[PDB]
Each structure stands twice: as C-alpha cells, then as structure tokens.
Scaffold this active site. Structure first.
Site, PDB file in Angstrom:
ATOM      1  N   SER A  46       1.364   9.850  13.475  1.00 16.42           N
ATOM      2  CA  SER A  46       0.563   9.290  12.389  1.00 16.42           C
ATOM      3  C   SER A  46      -0.879   8.983  12.790  1.00 16.42           C
ATOM      4  O   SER A  46      -1.775   9.019  11.943  1.00 16.42           O
ATOM      5  CB  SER A  46       1.228   8.039  11.816  1.00 16.42           C
ATOM      6  OG  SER A  46       1.333   7.026  12.797  1.00 16.42           O
ATOM      7  N   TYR A  80       4.425   6.916  15.728  1.00 16.05           N
ATOM      8  CA  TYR A  80       3.143   6.257  15.928  1.00 16.05           C
ATOM      9  C   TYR A  80       2.080   7.273  16.313  1.00 16.05           C
ATOM     10  O   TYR A  80       1.037   7.357  15.663  1.00 16.05           O
ATOM     11  CB  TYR A  80       3.251   5.152  16.982  1.00 16.05           C
ATOM     12  CG  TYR A  80       4.056   3.963  16.523  1.00 16.05           C
ATOM     13  CD1 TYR A  80       3.528   3.051  15.603  1.00 16.05           C
ATOM     14  CD2 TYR A  80       5.346   3.749  16.999  1.00 16.05           C
ATOM     15  CE1 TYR A  80       4.267   1.954  15.166  1.00 16.05           C
ATOM     16  CE2 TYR A  80       6.096   2.651  16.572  1.00 16.05           C
ATOM     17  CZ  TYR A  80       5.547   1.759  15.656  1.00 16.05           C
ATOM     18  OH  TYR A  80       6.283   0.676  15.236  1.00 16.05           O
ATOM     19  N   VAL A 138       0.790  -1.237   0.000  1.00 20.44           N
ATOM     20  CA  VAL A 138       0.000   0.000   0.000  1.00 20.44           C
ATOM     21  C   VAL A 138       0.827   1.295   0.000  1.00 20.44           C
ATOM     22  O   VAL A 138       0.296   2.375  -0.243  1.00 20.44           O
ATOM     23  CB  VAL A 138      -1.079   0.025   1.129  1.00 20.44           C
ATOM     24  CG1 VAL A 138      -1.672  -1.365   1.337  1.00 20.44           C
ATOM     25  CG2 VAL A 138      -0.515   0.566   2.437  1.00 20.44           C
TER      26      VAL A 138
END
Lengths: 246, 230, 230, 246
Positions: free
Chosen positions: C130, C127, C53
C-alpha cells in the site's frame, strides 16, 4: 543466445573476476571477444589489445585498430576490476580523482570512440557495470558510489541519444566474489584464509540471499542485455545484488 | 524558518540566476551569506570571496578564511569536445567534492550542518552524467557523515534563468516573441504547463538547509513541475 | 509560510501521533483545520467531522459539507489473514482514493490546491504494498491534475508514535527500559542513529502543502533519516 | 535455458498477447505450463485450470489441485491482459476497484497460496508483470498506475520475506502490441485498420525506440528472471519499455 555468435564484443579487462566471467560467457556464445586492458589474460580464446582506457589517445587508436581488424563492433562491456592501478591502500584526494578516472572516464572514452563504429554494426548494445566496491565499506567509498551513479547517468544519455540505432544499459552488482572483494576483506582482517572466509560470509549475510554473488551471475545479466532477448530493454540498470537494494 | 537566522551559509557560484536566487533567499532569512565564485557582483547584502571551486588550493584557503571570520559554517550550497566534457565534470562534480571535502570538518562543529547540492540543466552527455554523479556524491556524504551532518540534493528541471533564455535564443532567433513562444512550448513538456522560477528552487534549498528537514538526508528533491513524474 | 494562514486544510485520521502532529502543525500556521476520522478528540483549536474514510458515502457527504461551511478547500492530507490484508489496502489505499476523488473538484477552484499522502510504517505485506500504491496514486493524480492541483507524497520511516512504542513493547516486554533499548537500537538502523519525530514529518507535509513547493509535484519526500539512502 | 526444462510454470492467462508469448517461451524451454484463467487458450501444449484469480477460494483450490497433479510449482508468472472483465468502455468508481482487483489482488491471491508450495520446490521464482495500460492514456489510468506501483511493493515484500529460499521480481512493460493496446487504439480512433495502425505508430514514436514493443520481447525478460541465469537477481523491476522511463 544464437544472436551473440560471431558478434564483436569488447570487454575492458578480462583477466579475473567479473570481466573474466563475462569474457567466458560470450566465448561459449561464440563471439569474437576483444580484451581492452593493460594485461594479457593468458587464454588464447580472447584477443588482447594493449590499452589504458583512462588515456583517451590509447582508447582512440585501440578502438580504430579493433575496427580495422574485425570490421565490426557489436558489444561494448565497460567494467573495472583490478585495473585500478596505483597505491591502494587508502590515500584520498588524488585517489578520489583516479577512482573517478578508472570507474567513469574509462567508460566515457571507450564509449565516445566506439559509438561511431558501433552504429554501423548489427544490434549494437553497450553494457556498463558499476563497481563492486559501491556497497562494501568506506575506506572512502564515496568515489565508487559517485562513479556508479555517474555511470547510470552516462548510460541514460547514450540510451536516449542513440535509440533506436544502438542500445545502452547498466548492470549494478552488489558484493561479488572477486579479487577486488577478496582484497577488501584482506585489508580489513589481514591475509588469513579463515578470517577472509569469515568476513566474506559476514558480507553475505548483509544480503537477503545470505551469500555474496558469483561472477558467473553477473556474466548472465550482461549476456542477456547484450543479447537480442533484450532488444526492447534500454536505458535501465539491472540490479544483480541478491536483493540488497530493496 | 526561525533557525536559519544568523546561520553561516556558503553559496558557490551565487552570481546570477539559480545561484543569485538561493543567495538572496538566505539573505531574506536573516542568514549570513558568503559567495564563492570567480566573478564578484556589486553588494552590501552578502559577503563575497573570490574562489574558483575547481581549484582545491583556493577552495581550502577560502573556507579556512571563512571559518576564521565567522567561527562557524552551518550551510554549504554547491551550485552548478573531451576538454569541454572533462571541464563540465570538473565544474558540476569536482567543484562539489572540493568544497564539501574542506567545509565538512568545520561544519561538524557548527549548529545543524546541512549540505545542499544543486543538479544542473548537441550532446547533453556531461550534464546528465554529472547530475547523477552529484546524487551519488550526496548519498555517500550523507551516509558517511550522519548523524553529524545532513546532505541532500535539489534536482531542478527547466528554470527561467539567463542560461535557458539564451538556449531558446540560439534555436529560434533573438526575437523576444519567438523566444517567448519557445519558452511557452518547453513549459508544456512539463505537466505544469510552464517552466520553473529561480525562487521555487531557492525555496527547496532553504527548506533542506533548515531544521525543518532535520530527519531528511541523502535524498533528492525534484523541483521539476512533474517532469520526472513519468 | 505566509500563504498557509486561513487556508482550508483537511487532515484525515488526525487523532493521535503522525495525524495529531500534522493537524497541530497547520493550526500553528494560521490555517483552518478539519479532522476526518472515526474517533473524535477534545478540541477548540480545530474542527472535527465524524467520517470513516473507507466509506465513500460518508466521505462524499463530509467533503460536500466541509465546502458548504468554508466555501474553500486548499489542502488535503491523507494519513494512514486475507480479511486483515484487504482491510489494510482499504484503509491505507482506498481511503486516499475516496477523499481525493471527492475533494479534487472543490480543490480545483480554491487557492493553491495541494494534496499530500502519507505512507505508513509478522508479514509486512499489505503495508509495503500500500505504501507503493500510494506513490502510484500520488503520481497519477499529480499527472492528471497539473497544472490545476499539486499532489505529493511523504514517505516516513520509523517515527516515535504510539504505534511503534507498542511494536517494541510486544517484542521485549512492557518494561519502559527495555522498550527504550529496543527503540534506541532501531534508531541505529537509521544512519542518523535515531528514529524520527512526528514534528519532523509535519514539517515536510507543511512544506509540500504551501506555496514554497509550487513547482514540486508527483514526488515522494523521504523523512527517513537516510534509511533509503542505500 | 536448460534449467527451465520440466519445471512447473503457472501463467495467469495465456490465450493472447503477453501471456501467450510467455507461455510459448517456456514450452520451447520444455516446461509444464499451467494456464490459470477463465478461458481455455485452445493449444494442447499448455494445461488449463478454470479459475477466477480475483476470487481467493477459486485460487486456493486451483493451486492445491495444481500441486496434487505436478507435485511441484517452480514459477508463478502473474499477468493481466484481457481478463479484466466487465464493462470497458469507461465507468469509474466500481471500475477503479475492479481494476485493482484484477491487477493487484489477483497477484496477492495467487502468491499467498503458491508460496507455501513453491518453497518446497526447486529454484522457485515469482515474476510479476505490470499492466500495459500503465503508460498509455487516461480513460482513467490511475488504477493501472496505482496497481503497477502496488505490484512493485508486493514484489519487494515477497523478495525480502522469502529470500534465500524463493525469488521474486517484477517486469515493467511500456506499450506492447497486444489485444489490450489494440483495444485502447480502437476506443480512441474507432475500428479502422489504418487509423489503429497510425495511432499505434504514434504511440511508438513516444518511445525513443520509435516503435512499441512485441510480446516476445516481454516473454524474454520473464524467462530470464525465472531462469537460473537470474539466481542472484531478486526484488527488482526489469523495465521492458524501449527507454520510455528514462
């Protein structure tokens, strides 16, 4: 903050803790500080008006009286620290209502009667402070958490309704070293200076800043939001919490 | 939801509109529904108990009664001048506190207890204030009573309800075409180019009350068509 | 959900854990499921398409292909040193952008299109960053594409997944009793006195993808056991 | 704010708009202001260091260079206003990445290399500003909205990780009168002074304050959060938005 000089600033309770620190700040700024409470804070740099803010009639008159005097009301700082008066201790269902009276309705009454006069004045801003008891421990802190969120909602209404004429903002403190917090410690660990010290240290380590806040630190945010420096800031809460909410 | 069936669900002010649709939704789900309102409708589908939620005596009495009849309460749905102002805070807030306060002990002993509080909507003051109060109430309850009981909030925007139908009708006239135009226009304030449906609220309430939301607590679900997505 | 049946649902990184459980959940719901990952499992229940992806070419190709096979896409589930930092932002964020960018045109013409983005979790920096980026991405998509398409976010806290099982295992040892104690302890940080289950996430995703959430968009659903209820 | 006097303050782009207003403020406060950008802002009251903040190597060196000079780094103000350089206009998929580079990664690079030096210094605070383009209009503002939220997340990480040594906060502006916004108006209505004026007036009425903000008004919040007056405030966004978010 030169703009605060000589502006009429009403603090609802200025005898101790946060209310006192606030009161102190605006005096250094050169304001006409009015104390709306049930106790004279002793210091002859503020002027006291006898009023129970939970009683609308007393607020209504007191505000009008204040406006006949200083012919202006610029800043309204709503704050509740040791004027939550009755039996505390715990209780519950009547205590739940009374905390909502003090921490919410006192903010609504002071606001409803000040707004009409405030808009007539220069740079009017209202600053609402949440209870310090919000993040501490459930004696049953649900009324405190509720009226804190209620106060956000109130702040947001006023902000939206009275822009651009008048500004409104909330300051949301975590645990601040105040008579209110010292009492909470005492009810948890008794009245030993060390045990209260230790407990307060413990609450400090709950905050990433590894300490609890100082009243002076909440004074600053209030001064700032009431100031011209915040002339485009409105309808928001400024968290003075040592990063507790993150 | 295979768990909602035969679960005991109290729905306050479940008379019309949002309260109607939520009541009706659990009835669709096989649940046993009890309405706590002042005004009773016609019915065979779900129970009614005459109860003014701003009266703690009546509230206490009514919930005690409910538990004596069903031996269980799994779900509670709390649904929405100075006198008028204080009256709104009493209805929108104090009502939610009283029903919660009294139902909770019973709920802690029933299967999968879940509380769902619905927020509400000249001066929108007491409405906005109480909406946020309910969030605070939700949060504290959910904090105090985990992991025993879950509590969550549904925050709906403008929903097609009799209330709102009238709120347009006051502004433009009772002409059903101008009201339609006024409704359509309010819909365009929402990114979804339309106001909401009572069913769409009832869906979120049923989700949050079921085992599907078993790890969800102290949160508000916005059924607002993106209105808050600002 | 009577609408999810035979709906076309793309689930990225649906290999194990959270991605497994979401994939499996739609399969339970009568939906037609397609996995977009780098690693293919064994299967008969749902389609797989080999797709990294973070590669826009492969992404575009894969979604074009999917639409040619099924003539429909109703649901997309995007599921989670400086090089490593930039790699996380690529996976957790840029992956969600690419699949969204390419699926949307196809989705606008399918029945009830819905996008659901899952947030993620030394330095937790990339982390956390995002996670918030995904909220922003959700919000803008939901704003740009209403009333055509709905987009929402699921924000799970600590969930029982192989990832987390290992994250304890590094800290205390591979002893399955100390890991258990470490897991139990992390559970107590949550007001619900336990960490989450993959099923509990899969429930929220299925709710937000269905017609049940037809008026819900641009919002994050916290499956966190009250962790954010601070 | 006496505490800001002589503290080393790095603003990432200080030639025009917000970055300039910020830069101006801290100079009135008496700071050593360093400009990290690709353009010399002309004024000899700031010192310029040639750096493209999207390039980690350039940031790495530039920061070290800055620390060898002033032997201290107190404040890091991350801001992006007309250094988003390329073809704009619109484009999309490469443009989407480049906006994330400028509005997010430039914040991460400047932060990763400043933190180790900042913690060594007095009262270190990092202030992150969201893009003004966040609330305007979809050319395709998705990258701006995304990197704004990303910047909140980043702010919250840093805050939590580096408390109590170092503070981190975000300022979230709505539409502010800047070269960036004037450009957006121009791309919408062309380059007529009246038409751009009218359009900007229109964006002003979107805000309850019935006007858009001034760079000076965002300068104040930054100064405040960087100041000792905010010593207990950390991990939060201060909305300078004229009540748009309410």
């Amino acid at each position: 903050f030169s703009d605060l000089r000589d502006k009429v600033v009403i603090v609802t309770g200025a005898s101790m803790g946060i209310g006192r620190a606030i009161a102190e700040r605006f005096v250094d700024e050169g304001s006409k500080v009015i104390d709306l409470s049930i106790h004279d804070p002793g210091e002859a740099k503020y002027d006291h008006i006898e009023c129970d803010v939970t009683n609308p009639d007393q607020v209504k008159a007191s505000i009008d009286h204040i406006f006949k005097e200083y012919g202006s009301i610029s800043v309204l700082v709503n704050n509740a620290g040791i004027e939550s008066y009755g039996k505390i201790e715990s209780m519950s269902m009547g205590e739940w209502r009374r905390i909502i009276d003090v921490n919410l309705f006192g903010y609504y009454y002071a606001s409803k009667f000040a707004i009409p006069y405030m808009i007539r004045s220069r740079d009017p801003s209202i600053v609402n402070i949440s209870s310090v008891q919000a993040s501490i421990i459930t004696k049953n802190a649900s009324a405190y958490v509720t009226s804190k969120h209620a106060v956000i909602g109130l702040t947001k209404s006023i902000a939206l309704d009275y822009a651009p004429l008048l500004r409104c903002n909330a300051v949301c403190p975590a645990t601040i070293d105040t008579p209110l917090v010292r009492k909470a410690a005492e009810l948890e660990v008794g009245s030993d200076p060390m045990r209260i010290e230790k407990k307060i240290s413990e609450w400090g380590h709950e905050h990433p800043m590894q300490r609890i806040g100082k009243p002076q630190e909440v004074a600053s945010a209030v001064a700032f939001l009431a100031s011209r420096e915040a002339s485009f800031i409105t309808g928001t809460c400024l968290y003075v919490d040592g990063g507790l909410s993150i």
